[PDB]
């Protein structure tokens, strides 16, 4: 219902200095656009239209951005920030669960001592002469505002801009939409681990590990989401649920346990 394209921004930091450039990759996986993308860049009461004959828009101008592919609505807006401050908190545009998030914060051609990262306006971690904050496995526990502060040489301690880390799920929580939860004994019922992938992770292959009450049905994981059983007896009528995961098995979501009953 939402054919909205998306901008993929490289380098992944949404805020950069005045001396750099960033690439705006208007990616529409379905509804592919090799060219003819209307970049509706608005900064201050603007509607600057800069159409390009490719999918990439390398710019260096701050402001709100969005792309318009052929036959598709306008992209979800992305707020760039090209600032010439003294310390800037570099954050990824969008953080998904299980992503290896590195909240770097770097000065403007300076060495910053005693970098201290803040989350929700209180101390999170201390960095001795370090400009990198590392989150191994980002989850819902990691949200809210972030801003690192560090001492300059002798001018002033400086606090960076505030970024909002908002963890989004890579895919909707699975639901075990079996073909018929009341199959007469000896009939095939096709279990479906229904899951709508978030479009930002669309090239991701999904692994659907179906389950009985506690026994792993089938053989481990599989790419296909249709665990077509052949004949169901009164013995194997228990709770059924499926697990969905990405390639490294880092993000694992469990579908709610729906009961399957065999009619006789």
């Amino acid at each position: 219902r939402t054919p909205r394209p998306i901008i993929f921004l490289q380098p992944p930091w949404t805020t950069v200095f005045q001396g750099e450039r960033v690439t705006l990759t208007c990616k529409g996986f379905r509804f592919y656009s090799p060219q003819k993308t209307k970049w509706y860049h608005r900064y201050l009461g603007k509607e600057i239209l800069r159409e390009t004959p490719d999918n990439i828009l390398e710019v260096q101008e701050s402001g709100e951005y969005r792309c318009q592919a052929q036959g598709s609505p306008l992209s979800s807006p992305v707020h760039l920030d090209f600032s010439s401050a003294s310390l800037i908190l570099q954050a990824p545009l969008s953080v998904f669960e299980g992503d290896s998030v590195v909240l770097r914060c770097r000065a403007k051609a300076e060495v910053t001592l005693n970098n201290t990262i803040y989350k929700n306006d209180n101390v999170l971690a201390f960095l001795n002469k370090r400009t990198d904050f590392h989150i191994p496995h980002a989850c819902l526990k990691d949200n809210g505002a972030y801003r690192c502060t560090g001492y300059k040489e002798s001018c002033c301690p400086v606090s960076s801009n505030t970024v909002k880390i908002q963890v989004q799920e890579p895919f909707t929580r699975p639901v075990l939409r079996a073909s018929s939860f009341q199959p007469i004994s000896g009939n095939p019922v096709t279990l479906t681990c229904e899951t709508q992938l978030s479009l930002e992770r669309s090239d991701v292959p999904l692994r659907f590990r179906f389950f009985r009450d506690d026994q792993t049905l089938g053989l481990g994981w599989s790419l296909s989401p249709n665990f077509q059983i052949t004949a169901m007896w009164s013995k194997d009528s228990g709770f059924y649920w499926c697990k969905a995961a990405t390639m490294p098995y880092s993000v694992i979501s469990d579908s709610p346990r729906s009961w399957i009953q065999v009619q006789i």
Binding site: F181, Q182, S237, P256, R257, S258, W259, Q261
Partner: protein, 221 residues
């Protein structure tokens, strides 16, 4: 010259905000010479472009069954908005205009009384929970079953039945594995209807709901 039929949105499609009510406008008996049909929809007499149309399907009677469907925002149908399904065809010299809105009438709140199973089916391998839903009007009502916040799909619901006082009543039987009932799980009958407080009511139940937990007398040899 074609003819215009009409099916109102089903109770489920209008009751839960999760779903979306699709008012459908069945049209049959379309001439072969003029199969292109134009459909107009009115929101109190205002055109709306969002309404789509199923492709015409010729039946075994060599007539094209064209059907028009419009998404309806739930509060609009609930307050009683009037939707005019217009059929345009050059075979008919005039555009047929027909009207549908909410079936007016005073609503009566659905009393809900879920009943635990009797003791003598406990020996049977499948228990049968029950959710009497009585004293409501109209029959624009759906019943769903829940357990730990998840829907149950082994339930059946008898159609609404006219009652002595002119209201309706209906039942719903859930079949569960006897052990699931034995481990004291919670099953809740959720019933949604216009006359309810939030158009939703979830009367719950568990194993031995009725029994007051005071003292159990045991006598052993």
């Amino acid at each position: 010259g074609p003819s215009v039929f009409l099916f109102p949105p089903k109770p489920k499609d209008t009751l839960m905000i999760s779903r979306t009510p699709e008012v459908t406008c069945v049209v049959v008996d379309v001439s072969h010479e003029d199969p292109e049909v134009k459909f107009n929809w009115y929101v109190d007499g205002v055109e709306v472009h969002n309404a789509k149309t199923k492709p015409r399907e010729e039946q075994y009677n060599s007539t094209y069954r064209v059907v028009s469907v419009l998404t309806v925002c739930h509060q609009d149908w609930l307050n009683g908005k009037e939707y005019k399904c217009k059929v345009s065809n050059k075979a008919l010299p005039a555009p047929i205009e027909k009207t549908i809105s909410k079936a007016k009438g005073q609503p009566r709140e659905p009393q809900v009384y879920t009943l635990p199973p009797s003791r003598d089916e406990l020996t049977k391998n499948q228990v049968s929970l029950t959710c009497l839903v009585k004293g409501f009007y109209p029959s624009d009502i759906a019943v769903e079953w829940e357990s730990n916040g998840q829907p149950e799909n082994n339930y059946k619901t008898t159609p609404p039945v006219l009652d002595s006082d002119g209201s309706f009543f209906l039942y719903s039987k859930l079949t569960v594995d006897k052990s699931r009932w034995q481990q004291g799980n919670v099953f809740s009958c959720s019933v949604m209807h216009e006359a309810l407080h939030n158009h939703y009511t979830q009367k719950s139940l568990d194993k031995s709901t009725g029994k007051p937990t005071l003292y159990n007398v045991s006598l052993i040899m």
